[PDB]
Amino acid sequence: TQLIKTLNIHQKGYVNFDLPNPKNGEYLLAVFHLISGGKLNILQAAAEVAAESSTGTNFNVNTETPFSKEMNAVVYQIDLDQNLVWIAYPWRLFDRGGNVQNILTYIVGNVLGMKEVSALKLLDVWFPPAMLEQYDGPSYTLDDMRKYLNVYDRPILGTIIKPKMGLTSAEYAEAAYDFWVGGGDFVKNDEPQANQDFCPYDKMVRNVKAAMDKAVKETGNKKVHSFNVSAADFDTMIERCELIRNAGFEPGSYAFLIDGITAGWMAVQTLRRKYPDVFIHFHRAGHGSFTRPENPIGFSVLVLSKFARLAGASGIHTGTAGVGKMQGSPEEDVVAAQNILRFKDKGHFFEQEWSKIFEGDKDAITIAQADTARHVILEDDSWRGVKKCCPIISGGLNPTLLKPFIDVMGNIDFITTMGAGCHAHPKGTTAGAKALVQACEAYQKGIDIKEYAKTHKELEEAIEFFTK
Amino acid sequence: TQLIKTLNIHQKGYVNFDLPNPKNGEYLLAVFHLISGGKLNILQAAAEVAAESSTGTNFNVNTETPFSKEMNAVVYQIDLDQNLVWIAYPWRLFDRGGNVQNILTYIVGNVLGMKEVSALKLLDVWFPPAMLEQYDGPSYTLDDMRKYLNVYDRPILGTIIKPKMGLTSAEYAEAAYDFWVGGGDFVKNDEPQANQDFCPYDKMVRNVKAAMDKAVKETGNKKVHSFNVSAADFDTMIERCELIRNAGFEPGSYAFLIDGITAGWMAVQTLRRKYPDVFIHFHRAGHGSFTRPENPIGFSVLVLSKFARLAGASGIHTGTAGVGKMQGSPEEDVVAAQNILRFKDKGHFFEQEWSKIFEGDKDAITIAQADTARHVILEDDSWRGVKKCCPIISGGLNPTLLKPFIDVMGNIDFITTMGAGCHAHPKGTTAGAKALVQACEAYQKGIDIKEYAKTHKELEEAIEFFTK
Amino acid sequence: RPILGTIIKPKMGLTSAEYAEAAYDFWVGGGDFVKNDEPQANQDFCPYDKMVRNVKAAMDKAVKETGNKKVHSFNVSAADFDTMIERCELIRNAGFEPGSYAFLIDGITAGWMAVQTLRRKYPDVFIHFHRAGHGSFTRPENPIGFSVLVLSKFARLA
Amino acid sequence: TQLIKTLNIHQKGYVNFDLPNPKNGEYLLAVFHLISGGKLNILQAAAEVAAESSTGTNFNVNTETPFSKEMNAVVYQIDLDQNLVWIAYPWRLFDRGGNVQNILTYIVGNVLGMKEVSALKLLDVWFPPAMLEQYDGPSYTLDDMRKYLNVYD
Numbered sequence A, B: 001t002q003l004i005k006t007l008n009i010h011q012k013g014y015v016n017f018d019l020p021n022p023k024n025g026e027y028l029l030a031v032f033h034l035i036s037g038g039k040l041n042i043l044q045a046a047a048e049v050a051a052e053s054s055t056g057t058n059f060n061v062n063t064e065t066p067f068s069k070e071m072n073a074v075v076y077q078i079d080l081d082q083n084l085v086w087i088a089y090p091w092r093l094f095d096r097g098g099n100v101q102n103i104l105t106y107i108v109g110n111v112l113g114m115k116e117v118s119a120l121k122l123l124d125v126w127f128p129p130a131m132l133e134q135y136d137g138p139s140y141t142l143d144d145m146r147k148y149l150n151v152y153d154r155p156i157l158g159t160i161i162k163p164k165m166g167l168t169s170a171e172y173a174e175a176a177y178d179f180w181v182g183g184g185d186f187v188k189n190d191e192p193q194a195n196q197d198f199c200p201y202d203k204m205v206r207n208v209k210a211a212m213d214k215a216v217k218e219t220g221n222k223k224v225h226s227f228n229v230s231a232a233d234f235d236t237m238i239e240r241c242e243l244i245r246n247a248g249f250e251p252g253s254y255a256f257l258i259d260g261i262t263a264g265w266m267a268v269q270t271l272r273r274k275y276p277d278v279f280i281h282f283h284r285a286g287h288g289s290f291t292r293p294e295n296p297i298g299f300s301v302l303v304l305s306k307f308a309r310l311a312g313a314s315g316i317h318t319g320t321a322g323v324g325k326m327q328g329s330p331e332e333d334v335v336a337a338q339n340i341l342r343f344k345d346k347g348h349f350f351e352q353e354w355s356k357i358f359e360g361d362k363d364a365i366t367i368a369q370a371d372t373a374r375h376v377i378l379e380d381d382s383w384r385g386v387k388k389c390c391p392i393i394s395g396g397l398n399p400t401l402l403k404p405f406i407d408v409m410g411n412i413d414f415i416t417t418m419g420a421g422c423h424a425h426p427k428g429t430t431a432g433a434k435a436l437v438q439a440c441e442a443y444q445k446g447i448d449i450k451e452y453a454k455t456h457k458e459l460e461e462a463i464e465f466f467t468k
Numbered sequence C: 001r002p003i004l005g006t007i008i009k010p011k012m013g014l015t016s017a018e019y020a021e022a023a024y025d026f027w028v029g030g031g032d033f034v035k036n037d038e039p040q041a042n043q044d045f046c047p048y049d050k051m052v053r054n055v056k057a058a059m060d061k062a063v064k065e066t067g068n069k070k071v072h073s074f075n076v077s078a079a080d081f082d083t084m085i086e087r088c089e090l091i092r093n094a095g096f097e098p099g100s101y102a103f104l105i106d107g108i109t110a111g112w113m114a115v116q117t118l119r120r121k122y123p124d125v126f127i128h129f130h131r132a133g134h135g136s137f138t139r140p141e142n143p144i145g146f147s148v149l150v151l152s153k154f155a156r157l158a
Numbered sequence D: 001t002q003l004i005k006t007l008n009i010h011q012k013g014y015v016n017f018d019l020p021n022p023k024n025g026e027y028l029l030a031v032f033h034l035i036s037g038g039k040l041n042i043l044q045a046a047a048e049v050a051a052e053s054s055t056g057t058n059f060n061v062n063t064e065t066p067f068s069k070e071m072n073a074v075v076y077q078i079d080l081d082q083n084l085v086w087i088a089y090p091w092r093l094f095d096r097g098g099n100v101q102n103i104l105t106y107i108v109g110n111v112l113g114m115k116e117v118s119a120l121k122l123l124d125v126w127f128p129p130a131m132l133e134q135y136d137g138p139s140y141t142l143d144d145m146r147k148y149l150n151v152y153d
Ligand SMILES: O=C(O)[C@@](O)(COP(=O)(O)O)[C@H](O)[C@H](O)COP(=O)(O)O
Pocket: A160, A162, A164, A190, A191, A284, A285, A317, A318, A319, A320, A325, A326, A392, A393, A394, A395, A396, A397, A417, A418, A419, A420, A421, B052, B057, B058, B110, B113
């Protein structure tokens, strides 16, 4: 009321507390933690943020048409105690053809640089079904990799080949084989692993193909390697992708890892569209400045995961919820993982149903019940909703912390990669992989890891090394 | 000394205070503001940051080869009062072929997410000449656009067509013509301006071509439009680029604008390599979470500008140094602009010469003296050094603030775009452009804007509107 | 007068820009001929294409400044034929003035087949026979081998 | 010691007897039987050979960068009785793409023609695994021909 009266003529055009239905399908919804930078109240700063993020500037321009005002972002709700502002963005503003970076430019672009706000954090977003129809979403999912690996009822066990850099193609392939033949299913390139002169990319791909062939023949179990395809340009990325394709691995045995933050959302969308049959591994390296709680300006991990799911990433790192070495808590990481893995989640502020069909459809209710029961959904009915994005759990994880994270995760529908958790095991990479599989089996059987390690030497050695 | 003794075996491998020559060409140099997250001193947290950013993890992995330890990032200097840590990264770690996002993944990637640090801000970086040889740098520069525009001895005057979104192709072209025929040289797409359904991209390009043709014929002066080519994927971006190319504009009359942060560094490098003859307009929308001083985790504006120059961007927004609406001060913005515009700058912590030749070369000294004298350098001798990256000054700027920013800028070698400074002028876009040109002429003649506006109605109206 | 030439020292370790700068420094100082050192190739710190482009720019600058033509001898010895011809075509499509570039081949290490292939594919290009490794054949301290005269005669025949 | 003190400034950049790990993977190792050709001792001749076979000449050139010194071949060991010199060549010097004749041009190229040495025989070389990854190696082997011929034992 009073804050509305404090608004000038320009700011009033971007504030509508009497918006009749924010969830009518015309508006993406964004909740911002907002603290003004000085001399502006919360509502004035929110109006400036909405103008700078939809259509306007610090002033009313004389070129403003009545049609332009329809595209205005409007503040439709404010919590004064929490400093929360809700903004409805007409998704007509966004670039057509499922352009996610255009959305990020609108909502988490210039507004982060504004001195009018001392804190601007996009906590959550809500995608209407009409807007959700515009975007690709995932095409390859965790269920497809589960089918390829024949891994069900447990998290897909993965590793990151440590050292991060400095190994040759032969050494990297040897480490990948050592993890694979030890029982591990998933091996990923470290995020900066690329065509370095001491580890050439084609040699690395060929050696990884040979190592995976040997591991598959020895264990009788399929294996998956996630190749980092982040390059200087598109041509190098697609050349590396085609090099992986023409190796040639079995279909499903390789995933395309892209550094989403650094390489860009364009690279993620290009990989998703060019290779819909390949698991797109979204690596979120560099996300911290956006998502760290110490940083007042940015967007939450939940928003990043939601936009990664929208962009078509098959999976994205979500965080260990403070169990690992990455910041910082379960309330962000587990919530984001549930939101990207579930057909419907809470989440932080918006009830996000990833269905693209009518709200009260009986088939939608059946799909939600099946998704809650952990059955595969959207296989023959992919039009109904967005496919799930697989959470990927990494960062300072050893087998001893496998059970606690699941205790925070609430489920086992995720890929877990442990670089130092296995390669820093005193008895080698294969011993670390065996210890990880032993910890997973102990969790599956309900046996405590200390009790389980009495008959499993690798698990006991991992507990002894990783407890100090 | 004591902090070195506090280090364990793993951390000692990433700390070398006795590094004999950090500037030997083997190491990129990075200065980090670092505050530990808890239970770790400054040296321990710096060692973890260096390990996580070069080769290692929280532990020593048994796969580590002696060759791997050579690629270790080493902390070679620490200021305890300022909480500053210097890390030398062997640039052998970085992906070959001039991949900049690989560098960003190494140095400002995973380390931002580490809970071991409560503050981690990359304040500055230093590129050795041997490393600088590996990267493209700019190919089209501000000097080429100055030659095309026939604009010398004053900043290139530019505008952003406000409203940011909501105008049709005809209205946008009309606003661009109104600025161009008013004396303004440069018109840019707003950062999210793309193929929206109400402003189709091909229609916008054709209408902008017609408007620029009309403005060029009426004024007898060439004009430049910067088109936003940020798309969902590479194919859409190149389709829009080719659409601009086959419009067909005069060569030099169009620039390719890319949202570098959101669309990604891969898009910037791809635009640089595919179109070296086109001004690559780096728009840094979303940079704030990286660069805002309120955010303890990220990298400085200077580092972003330096990496944009390395990636081949012809120009990048640098900030109004607190004069405009964007945060927040001259010490970051002006320093970054000088570092990307000069052949050699201070800068924050490293003396960065952008020459790729011997440090004491007489020709290098002559080139530096010519660059200080504002002569065009590196035309016939582009091997010698990296071409300058033009600073672009935008954000809450009206003509009344044109003189003060130059007072902080120390030069007029920049493109200045004013969206609300001209389109919010009460007498229209052409009146705003005339007021901006009048303010520029008043600065060039030393006449105060209040004195100059007595014989120039547009400048007086702009002052009256923008002084309150 | 003899054609004045130089070899860019250091032999290795210079970037493409530093190499082109040294070549320009010799060229603008009155020197006519600049050659790749015999192992100078597509090293990671001095990429071959960047070296060729920078040498082309430096030769252009020296030619305009001095008003005299300049010649650079590029080492085209590679691992295989395909790499050698790729480097040769990279030199040709730089594109230098015809006669301003010579092809340097390590005739002993790379082999006589490389020398003959360079001669037959590029008869209009000066074939620079570098004889690195010849000493074991030609050193007087070595009782087994062949004289320098024999090596020169077979080079001229090839 | 005394041979180290006999060296000049130029030769000292190609002699490092305190090389910490010659087998760290950065260096191809070469052992040379070396007898100097007159007025140079074993260490000076070895330094000249290392300079001529990695980056240097008979003098210090003014174009030498600090990066260039990182590519210097260094004599890291000497057997005075056997006239043996160990030189660590950073394999960064070698042409990329598995170029073997480039390696031979470096190590057994110009140095054979030097008059500063009266005997220069490369007895042995050691390839680090990181260097060995760069090169092809045999693809068809004696085992393949044994399988084709059905000839074993
Ligand atoms: O390099 C690394 O740090 C990791 O490989 C983990 O290594 P360790 O498991 O051996 O520690 C992961 O890439 C990061 O955890 C990603 O972070 P996030 O999951 O938060 O996106």
